[PDB]
Amino acid sequence: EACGYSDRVLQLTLGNSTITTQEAANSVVAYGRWPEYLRDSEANPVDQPTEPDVAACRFYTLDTVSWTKESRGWWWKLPDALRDMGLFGQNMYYHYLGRSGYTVHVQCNASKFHQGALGVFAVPEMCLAGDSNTTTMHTSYQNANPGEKGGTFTGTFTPDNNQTSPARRFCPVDYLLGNGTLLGNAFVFPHQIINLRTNNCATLVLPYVNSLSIDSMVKHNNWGIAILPLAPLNFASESSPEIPITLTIAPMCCEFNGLRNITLPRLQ
Amino acid sequence: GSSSTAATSRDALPNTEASGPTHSKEIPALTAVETGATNPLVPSDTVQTRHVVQHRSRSESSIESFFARGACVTIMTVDNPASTTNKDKLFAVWKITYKDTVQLRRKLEFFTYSRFDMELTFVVTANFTETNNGHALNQVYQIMYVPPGAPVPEKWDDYTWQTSSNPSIFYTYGTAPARISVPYVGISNAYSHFYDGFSKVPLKDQSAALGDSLYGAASLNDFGILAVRVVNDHNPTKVTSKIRVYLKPKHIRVWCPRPPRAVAYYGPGVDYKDGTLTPLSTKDLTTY
Amino acid sequence: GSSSTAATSRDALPNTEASGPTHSKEIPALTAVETGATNPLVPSDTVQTRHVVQHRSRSESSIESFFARGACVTIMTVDNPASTTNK
Amino acid sequence: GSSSTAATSRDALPNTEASGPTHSKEIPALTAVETGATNPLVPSDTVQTRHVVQHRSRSESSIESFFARGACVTIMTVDNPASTTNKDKLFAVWKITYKDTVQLRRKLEFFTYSRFDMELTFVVTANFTETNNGHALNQVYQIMYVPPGAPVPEKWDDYTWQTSSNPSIFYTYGTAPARISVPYVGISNAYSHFYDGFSKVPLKDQSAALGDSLYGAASLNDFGILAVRVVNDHNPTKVTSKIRVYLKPKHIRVWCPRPPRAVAYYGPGVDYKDGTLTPLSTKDLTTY
Amino acid sequence: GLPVMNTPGSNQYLTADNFQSPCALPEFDVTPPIDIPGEVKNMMELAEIDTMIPFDLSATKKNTMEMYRVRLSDKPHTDDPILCLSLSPASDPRLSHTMLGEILNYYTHWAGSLKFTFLFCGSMMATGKLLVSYAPPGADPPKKRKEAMLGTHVIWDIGLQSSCTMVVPWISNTTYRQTIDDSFTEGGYISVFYQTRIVVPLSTPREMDILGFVSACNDFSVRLLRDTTHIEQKA
Amino acid sequence: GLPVMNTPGSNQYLTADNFQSPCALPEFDVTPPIDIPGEVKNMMELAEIDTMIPFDLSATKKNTMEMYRVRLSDKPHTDDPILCLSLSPASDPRLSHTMLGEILNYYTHWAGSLKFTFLFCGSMMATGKLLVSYAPPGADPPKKRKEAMLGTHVIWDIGLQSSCTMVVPWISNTTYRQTIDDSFTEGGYISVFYQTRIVVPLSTPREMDILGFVSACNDFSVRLLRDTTHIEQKA
Amino acid sequence: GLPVMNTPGSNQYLTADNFQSPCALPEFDVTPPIDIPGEVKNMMELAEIDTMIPFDLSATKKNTMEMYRVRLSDKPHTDDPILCLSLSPASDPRLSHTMLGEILNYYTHWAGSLKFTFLFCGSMMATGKLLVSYAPPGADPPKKRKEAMLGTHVIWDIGLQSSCTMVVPWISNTTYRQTIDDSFTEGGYISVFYQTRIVVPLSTPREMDILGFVSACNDFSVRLLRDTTHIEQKA
Amino acid sequence: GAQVSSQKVGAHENSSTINYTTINYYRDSASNAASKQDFSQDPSKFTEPIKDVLIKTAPMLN
Amino acid sequence: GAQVSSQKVGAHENSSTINYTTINYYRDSASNAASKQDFSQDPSKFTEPIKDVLIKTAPMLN
Amino acid sequence: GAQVSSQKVGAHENSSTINYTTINYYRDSASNAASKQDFSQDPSKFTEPIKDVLIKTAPMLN
Ligand SMILES: CCCCCCCCCCCCC/C=C/[C@@H](O)[C@@H](N)CO
Ligand SMILES: CCCCCCCCCCCCC/C=C/[C@@H](O)[C@@H](N)CO
Ligand SMILES: *C(=O)CCCCCCCCCCCCC
Ligand SMILES: *C(=O)CCCCCCCCCCCCC
Ligand SMILES: *C(=O)CCCCCCCCCCCCC
Numbered sequence A: 001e002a003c004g005y006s007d008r009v010l011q012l013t014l015g016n017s018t019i020t021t022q023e024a025a026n027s028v029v030a031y032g033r034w035p036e037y038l039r040d041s042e043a044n045p046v047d048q049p050t051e052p053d054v055a056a057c058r059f060y061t062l063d064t065v066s067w068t069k070e071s072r073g074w075w076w077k078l079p080d081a082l083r084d085m086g087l088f089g090q091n092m093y094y095h096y097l098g099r100s101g102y103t104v105h106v107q108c109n110a111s112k113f114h115q116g117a118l119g120v121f122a123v124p125e126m127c128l129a130g131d132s133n134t135t136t137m138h139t140s141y142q143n144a145n146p147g148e149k150g151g152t153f154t155g156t157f158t159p160d161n162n163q164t165s166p167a168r169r170f171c172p173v174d175y176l177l178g179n180g181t182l183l184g185n186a187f188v189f190p191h192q193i194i195n196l197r198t199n200n201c202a203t204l205v206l207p208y209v210n211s212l213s214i215d216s217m218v219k220h221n222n223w224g225i226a227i228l229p230l231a232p233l234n235f236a237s238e239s240s241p242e243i244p245i246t247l248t249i250a251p252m253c254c255e256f257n258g259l260r261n262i263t264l265p266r267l268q
Numbered sequence B, D: 001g002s003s004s005t006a007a008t009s010r011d012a013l014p015n016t017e018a019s020g021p022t023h024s025k026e027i028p029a030l031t032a033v034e035t036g037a038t039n040p041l042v043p044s045d046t047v048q049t050r051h052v053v054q055h056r057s058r059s060e061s062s063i064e065s066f067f068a069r070g071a072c073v074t075i076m077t078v079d080n081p082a083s084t085t086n087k088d089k090l091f092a093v094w095k096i097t098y099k100d101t102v103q104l105r106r107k108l109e110f111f112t113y114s115r116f117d118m119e120l121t122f123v124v125t126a127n128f129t130e131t132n133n134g135h136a137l138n139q140v141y142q143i144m145y146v147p148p149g150a151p152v153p154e155k156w157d158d159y160t161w162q163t164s165s166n167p168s169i170f171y172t173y174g175t176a177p178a179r180i181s182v183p184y185v186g187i188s189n190a191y192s193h194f195y196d197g198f199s200k201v202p203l204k205d206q207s208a209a210l211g212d213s214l215y216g217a218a219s220l221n222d223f224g225i226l227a228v229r230v231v232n233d234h235n236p237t238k239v240t241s242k243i244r245v246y247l248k249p250k251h252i253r254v255w256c257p258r259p260p261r262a263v264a265y266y267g268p269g270v271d272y273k274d275g276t277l278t279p280l281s282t283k284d285l286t287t288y
Numbered sequence C: 001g002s003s004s005t006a007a008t009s010r011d012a013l014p015n016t017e018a019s020g021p022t023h024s025k026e027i028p029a030l031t032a033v034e035t036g037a038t039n040p041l042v043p044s045d046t047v048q049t050r051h052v053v054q055h056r057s058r059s060e061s062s063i064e065s066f067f068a069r070g071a072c073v074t075i076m077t078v079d080n081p082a083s084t085t086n087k
Numbered sequence E, F, G: 001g002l003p004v005m006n007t008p009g010s011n012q013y014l015t016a017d018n019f020q021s022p023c024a025l026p027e028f029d030v031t032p033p034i035d036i037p038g039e040v041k042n043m044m045e046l047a048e049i050d051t052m053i054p055f056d057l058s059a060t061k062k063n064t065m066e067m068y069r070v071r072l073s074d075k076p077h078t079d080d081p082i083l084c085l086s087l088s089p090a091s092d093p094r095l096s097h098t099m100l101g102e103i104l105n106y107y108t109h110w111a112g113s114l115k116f117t118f119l120f121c122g123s124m125m126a127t128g129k130l131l132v133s134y135a136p137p138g139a140d141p142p143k144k145r146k147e148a149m150l151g152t153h154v155i156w157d158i159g160l161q162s163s164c165t166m167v168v169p170w171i172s173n174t175t176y177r178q179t180i181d182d183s184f185t186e187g188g189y190i191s192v193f194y195q196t197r198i199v200v201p202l203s204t205p206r207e208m209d210i211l212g213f214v215s216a217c218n219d220f221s222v223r224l225l226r227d228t229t230h231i232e233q234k235a
Numbered sequence H, I, J: 001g002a003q004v005s006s007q008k009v010g011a012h013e014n015s016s017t018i019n020y021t022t023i024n025y026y027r028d029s030a031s032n033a034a035s036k037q038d039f040s041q042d043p044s045k046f047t048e049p050i051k052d053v054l055i056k057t058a059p060m061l062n
Helices: A086-094 A183-188 B064-066 B104-108 C064-065 D062-066 D103-108 E043-047 E097-103 E143-151 F043-047 F098-106 F145-148 G043-047 G099-102 G145-149
Strands: A009-012 A018-022 A023-030 A067-068 A074-078 A095-107 A112-122 A191-197 A201-206 A222-237 A243-260 B073-082 B092-095 B111-128 B138-148 B170-174 B179-183 B225-230 B238-259 D071-080 D092-095 D111-129 D140-146 D167-172 D178-181 D225-230 D239-257 E002-005 E069-073 E083-086 E107-111 E114-120 E128-137 E152-157 E162-168 E189-194 E207-216 E221-225 F001-006 F069-073 F083-086 F107-110 F114-120 F129-135 F154-157 F164-170 F191-194 F206-214 F221-225 G004-006 G067-074 G083-086 G108-112 G113-119 G131-133 G152-157 G162-169 G188-196 G207-216 G222-225 H004-005 H017-024 I005-007 I018-023 J004-007 J017-023
Touching: A009 A095, A067 A222, A074 A243, A086 A095, A086 A243, A086 F098, A095 A222, A095 E152, A112 A183, A183 A222, A183 E043, A183 F098, A191 A201, A222 A243, A222 F206, A222 G099, B064 B104, B064 B238, B073 B092, B073 B104, B073 B225, B104 E152, B111 B170, B111 D140, B138 B238, B225 B238, C064 D167, D062 D239, D062 F001, D071 D103, D071 D225, D071 F114, D111 D167, D111 E152, D111 G004, D140 D239, D167 D178, D178 E043, D225 D239, D239 I018, E043 E097, E043 E207, E043 E221, E083 G152, E097 F001, E107 J017, E114 E128, E143 E189, E152 E162, F043 F206, F043 F221, F098 G207, F114 F129, F114 I005, F129 F145, F129 F164, F145 F191, F154 F164, G043 G099, G043 G222, G099 G207, G113 G131, G131 G145, G131 G162, G152 G162
Parallel strands: A023 A201, E002 F001, F001 G004
Antiparallel strands: A009 A018, A067 A243, A074 A222, A095 A201, A095 A243, A112 A191, A112 A222, B073 B238, B092 B225, B111 B179, B111 B238, B138 B170, B138 B225, D071 D239, D092 D225, D111 D178, D111 D239, D140 D167, D140 D225, E069 E207, E083 E189, E107 E221, E114 E162, E114 E207, E128 E152, E128 E189, F069 F206, F083 F191, F107 F221, F114 F164, F114 F206, F129 F154, F129 F191, G067 G207, G083 G188, G108 G222, G113 G162, G113 G207, G131 G152, G131 G188, H004 H017, I005 I018, J004 J017
8 A cells, every 4th residue: 555554554443452563474274264154054953052152253463482593383272272262262162062163373583593383283173193102192181271371392202111001101202293294295285384583473263164164162172273483582692582372262263052051171 | 759959168278378478567377275266377477389289188087077086985795605514604794885995985085075876786606615516506596775773684595585674686596696776875975084082972960981982983874784695505515705896986076185095994983003104215406 | 768867865864943941831842742742852842952064864864775785684505415325 | 869870981982994905105004103102093994804893892901990900018916815825915015007918019110109098997807725624705906096106005905996086997717807088198299109319318418327317208107006916814714816908999090191000019119030031931032 | 689798786676675576476456545644754754743751760660550659849949960861862761661762672873852841740739840950061960950940941930831841952063963972972960850849738648740851843754774782582 | 588698807897897786766756955165076086285394204293283394594505405306296295185196096107297386484674595496316316406407497586476387397217217226216316405595684584494285287197096095994 | 677588699799799888988178189180980981992913923022122123125126025913902922012902801702893004114315105004804814915915904105104004994793702712713914015116315324114003993892891911929 | 558656855966856757568557666746634533533624723612 | 858068078089079978877866977067166265365455466464 | 960861872672862860968078979070172382382383284293
């Protein structure tokens, strides 16, 4: 717009929450599909669904992590990461079934004198590799689901050797996308790159993806949010620089079925 | 009567258009991968091109064309010993799947979800095991499909082989390899090449061991099993047979693309194993 | 020449209709099995339901479909011995 | 529905016209071969001819008709030994081509370039090798097509035989000889019976041995290879089999004619060998 | 002779195949059909008919006329369950052998809404209010009215209308469920409780039996025909 | 019976054949499709998507997050190459494992125009001008800007627009190239250089990384489906 | 299944048969044809092109550039033959290896009119008159101009027009002749003589060579395709 | 005498109703294959065999 | 019930569109062969998944 | 989709044009048999490749 409007400057508003950004590289809509409610033609569960709307379909800001020369990368799972977030987590646990889209806004600012590139990826059914070489598909429910704090990637695969009392957890190696495939190709998946010299953040609008119209949000995680350093953090001359990466996410057009007593998971 | 017969998989790709010199404010070559998008550029955007009538097609690279080939998913071993032998007549029981072998699995795995009518072709080969000299009359195999819940056979000749309800294929040795078609039988709207979750929810209030289950594993018994046996009675001279199962995905559809399996498969899940994580070979930055 | 081609065994089952709250003199949930009959009830009669377009069919459960399978009724034993055998 | 049906290959040749005496300035008989042309003369030009209604045709001498015959291009040898034998189960690997044999090659070579759909027919014959007496159950052969770049088999039973993507033919002994069709697969607009050049350009600035390559040889691997094996497991009594491959060029087109091969073939190229250069026999100038 | 080429599957015998074949008894005078009453067109029709549930499968009651009787009493109000049952129509011992459960075991997959009808066989002078509950999977199986009350339920009031029907709505993640015990395709919990308490006057029996029946709603269907385990021929 | 005569190919099993066959599960109630996002119709669609190139496959960097990073510096102008690469999409170690290279290895022949996009991951305060070159086969592979400048190239100027795309035009003698290293079907050389030199102010990092991506142009296609060597099952 | 009955010839492999068959490479992107010069539609087209005859197949001249040269001289008139040749296009050593003879050996039967063209490679100052003869079978093969003159012939006069063509008309008892030496299907005799005598002035070569060429007239055809003896593979 | 019918199409290819052709070779009906073109009926005769038609919204016993 | 279609003709003989006839023998779609008559689609949903449509001649970031 | 053509009839029986019926079973042209319905052409490009068209009755060289 000769009037002023621009790709880099956006304003997102959901329920009682609003996000502003003066340095964005546009925004991405996974597979060109904007989140939507379950249609009658595609519906399964016959009971009147619970649609929290503004109470849950708003912006939740998770615990801010620190990016450094040493960082190999971070990972999160949806809905798992939002499981303890206000009215959204409450409605998710009270219902047998649930479906939801997301507006993922990854925030990470610095300075015209800093360097680095964060590869922000949205992966459908992001199944990760375990820490065991004597057994398989053994990663425990508690460890597979870190909740809000999420997990992290490792530059090296080090097998759990304690056969007696197994760590029973994931060993996601960075260059292999934590799942047996080459990172260089992760780009076939809905994503955006946070290149310090070009932009403050990454905005990904994710639709409800799955082999089913609606499923068990507590048993199954539809989307995986992977953040890896394509180009290592670097500043002026400081040998050990640091910058925060804040992750804010908002559930969308989300709905729930099969209402009963609240589900109290064994998360530890 | 006779019924005769928008962009088709076999339509000729776009023609290259004649392009001259340029001194403008338009910058096709310049861009910003950060946005998540790939520059839709073509030769004529960065160099002077001539006019070329394109005849080439993407016919063979289409989803159906890419998989339109019978692939080996398993090798079943059965036999027919001498009545006297102390050891039991060996009848085969195989849990149906595309993961026992690597080739077809890697191809299907280029994608998250899939949908398709399944064509199973059975190649049967037999042979003599003992430096004997006795012979054996032409064998007749019975390939029975046992769906999850149905009485799984415990003996090469027990009541279950009656197949009153289950689908059975009675194959005759030396004859054209057996073949049958199967519809999209998934309890879901599409097959899940990957399941980022569990079949059970570990409830605090309830004993640890109880709420436990395998990672990435849905229905303990997805599609039941293939129970194969040699119908013929025990023969003085022992004959061992092998049943090779060829699986071909037809009328197929696929969703959400993924990066191909870069390192040696290690079990039914995405798990990798130590010593196999270094696929790429040595090659210098400035060497052609 | 060519010959081309009411409720069919393979027709989609009845769609689930959107149903709201109720405070009436009508009592679907209440009945009397003693009469020999079975209460023709449906989800929308005892709970608040959403509108659902039903695609499912009873095709495979039809009398023909249920028995449309070759079943083993007997195993006959015969033979051909050496001329000499006494039996 | 039904679709029913300029000079045709099977049209009657031109009729001979009645010709009388001549005393003119016209000189058909006289000419000059130096110009590069051949005198279009006919009987009626040099002698008194009668009127003749011609019924004869060139039907059988047409390009398709001339090659419309299945020709043997190779004999592949495979086997199935006793498990015990120290030597490996012998599986065949043949580099596809029309030059291993002479007959068909000489015919195709009457021309520089060619184009055609290829029909491959496989005749399989087996037999016993040892003065033994043991027998063997009916064998099932696996003819796998391995295109340039794909994992070539190293063992009669290794992972490659899965043929997830490659085209394989599972032939059953004693049954009608196997047969498949193949399109015009050349990376060029037409097959080159002859290539007057090399696959590499010897660059001064670069080491002699590096820029070196075979004369008249293009793609080191034109069309990949045919990998054949006996699917059946090792049998106490050893059985040797032979696979004869018949090649027939259909829907064929040819360009730039050449003089037929006058002397014994010596390798894949035009090379001749000492002692074979004297084809023609003794016959006197003035002897009938 | 017309040129033909045999393809894979040739000469094979597919027990499930559907082709023509020569008639051993040509021109045979077939005996016509008579309008016989009670004709069935679809196995599902039988599944839609109310069949009595063997609820009390306890060591001593099982395999006897007693397993069908769920005993109640004029005793004081308690938030504890009268009877707990898993929504596994084909696998759960109490449902697996009912007309519905039996037909389900001839199939691999099941879908749609079920309906549970309870009959009060106590005396006319006996009043009471019971709470029939249905709790979709994923949480702690209800062991107290409090929890059961929170999910799909019906407060049954005992009177002239002898029976009360509770509809278990088709609520599932997958388009179809498996006819066997399976964590992934689990149906949830069906439980019954005392809303208030069975009250009776003097000269009247303080204990009575309630019968329970299960049947399929018109939205119900099954697929993937298969051989059942409910019958065998060892030998 | 209708007179028929069997022809060659009869009773054979062609893994690539395309015929009809009896259905093992007749009348089976098939579960309908739901409009699932991200549907693909042609493998080539994936080849048209930008995928990161493992350029620095050196002894110590290979098989680690580092192989993806091509390091530059504020150092003085030099006509020497930043990185040399062969146009062998399917065979060359640096291209063979990229989404494009991987799909190419399932096919015997490849054709059309490729496009290489380079991303400058250095600081905003850092300026510079690089020369991205493409030299069609037949001559001495460029080892100096001078030679590289003489063929198909693009002078990339670093600024607001983070990345620069160089299109490698479909320039070949044969209608199709082989998915393997082959003198006859050779593609030529892709090399990168310093047009001027990476310049940076004080208090700023004199060294930065540039990422590189490869994808196929709309004129691109593959043929002759085949089994790949990028995966195996020894045992 | 449709009732069918197999007939003789079933399952057999006729190397000359003409049927359909499954394609090993389905949907394969075939490379189009380019208008390449020199396209042939019928083997007979090649037979209609003038090809040099190896006339002098004598012990020392045979298998050398010399066999093609028929030497003449300014010597005195003689009724004796310059060269005698049998009309056996496919069998006669002097014709069997010419383009025409070679194609004829791939066939069992031949028919139609042939034409023999002779080129005078002597000096411009050299004059002369030769007699080219053709004598249909059944009589004493001509050994003297006298006899040769009595049958089909042409009196060639040497001048500006370097060459002279003699047409051997299709004169036979059978509709077709055999591509081998056969008394019954014999073609007759082709002989050449001195009508007057090759005359040359002083300071000029008294000896010169005449080249001879054979080709088929538009009324010419062949049949019954067969394997030739002109090439083999002993081993 | 060819009998052309419609296939209720399940999983469709990335490739309008599809049909299948059937022809009877034998003179005897018994020789013929199963059409599978069968009809459904309302369970009434079994689920509600009562003389006086019943209305679900109203009291079964009145 | 015969389904007649066109063969995209590759290498033509020295011999107008050519056709091939197809007929379905079975009642179940699954039993049917692969038509290969498939459709192409534009990569957009993957190569350009961005909210604001992009013009190649202009600055990606503005 | 049936293709009906004429057989050039050789030795006729003591028994009007005779025809033969052809039908294509496969989708790929390569799978098809050889029509044999081929065309002839004039040898000119080889027997008379000369720039200036030649008249047989007149002097080749003039
Ligand atoms: C007489 C032979 C009858 C053959 C019966 C075969 C029916 C069973 C077919 C199951 C198809 C499974 C295909 C692969 C599905 C997997 O990807 C799942 N884990 C994904 O949902
Ligand atoms: C299961 C069997 C599959 C059979 C696969 C065969 C495909 C390969 C066919 C290649 C055709 C080569 C024909 C001769 C070409 C030579 O003349 C070349 N040197 C000329 O360009
Ligand atoms: C009605 O059928 C007329 C159309 C006939 C189509 C051709 C029939 C194919 C072969 C049938 C012969 C019957 C076998 C006894
Ligand atoms: C539509 O198909 C009418 C034309 C019928 C042509 C004859 C069919 C050939 C044989 C088909 C019988 C079907 C096999 C079950
Ligand atoms: C055009 O062909 C319509 C006429 C059809 C005649 C019946 C065809 C005979 C059988 C053909 C089936 C094709 C085999 C794949």
